[PDB]
Amino acid sequence: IVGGYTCGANTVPYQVSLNSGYHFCGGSLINSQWVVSAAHCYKSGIQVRLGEDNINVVEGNEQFISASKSIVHPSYNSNTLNNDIMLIKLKSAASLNSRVASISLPTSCASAGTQCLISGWGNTKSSGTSYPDVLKCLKAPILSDSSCKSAYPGQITSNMFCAGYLEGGKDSCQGDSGGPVVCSGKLQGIVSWGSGCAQKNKPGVYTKVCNYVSWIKQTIASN
Numbered sequence: 001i002v003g004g005y006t007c008g009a010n011t012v013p014y015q016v017s018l019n020s021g022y023h024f025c026g027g028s029l030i031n032s033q034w035v036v037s038a039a040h041c042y043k044s045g046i047q048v049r050l051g052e053d054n055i056n057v058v059e060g061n062e063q064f065i066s067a068s069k070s071i072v073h074p075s076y077n078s079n080t081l082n083n084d085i086m087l088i089k090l091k092s093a094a095s096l097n098s099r100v101a102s103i104s105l106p107t108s109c110a111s112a113g114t115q116c117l118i119s120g121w122g123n124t125k126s127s128g129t130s131y132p133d134v135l136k137c138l139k140a141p142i143l144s145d146s147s148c149k150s151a152y153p154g155q156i157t158s159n160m161f162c163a164g165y166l167e168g169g170k171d172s173c174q175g176d177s178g179g180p181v182v183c184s185g186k187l188q189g190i191v192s193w194g195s196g197c198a199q200k201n202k203p204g205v206y207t208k209v210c211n212y213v214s215w216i217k218q219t220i221a222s223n
Helices: 145-151 209-221
Strands: 015-019 023-031 034-037 047-050 063-072 086-090 115-120 136-141 160-163 180-183 186-193 204-208
Touching: 015 034, 023 047, 023 186, 023 209, 034 186, 034 209, 086 209, 115 186, 145 160, 160 186, 186 209, 204 209
Parallel strands: none
Antiparallel strands: 015 023, 015 047, 023 034, 034 086, 047 063, 063 086, 115 136, 115 180, 160 204, 180 186, 186 204
């Protein structure tokens, strides 16, 4: 997250870290058994880390749970990042508490201008590299579809939306991929892609979660 702020320990209790020997992506807990992330975060041997603040220090509220299975969306296209969504099942159910909590799925899309909370452990610099140890947060509005498509002509599908600031300086980053965009108490987006981070007229692009709720519900019910 570039241009954001330190969230505060466990203030985003649905935020998970995906670990394969190191943090590599975010995710969101959607019930005690299931995490949603980005398909471009797929790899084998994922351990889900819940209750994290400082990802480099055991602080006492963590749960580390191996994934038993990962399911990439059937229509995921790695060339265009269309349908950039994946589900991860936990080998054992998480223990829900004030620091480890699920986020509700949306019933409908959010309107342009709605304020959202974006979070993750990604790079905090727009040109250089500096990775934080504690969770970072950004408040960012949903941008109009026209401003989103104007920024990325030929590249935005109906399964994507933009959020952030056309003036730059505030964006998600590499390392935030797969993490949540939460608006009005619902998981509206997944950190997906963008043109670098915090550049001018190139806002962040996010998977449009509301388009996938039927697939999420059917897939988790059958797995």
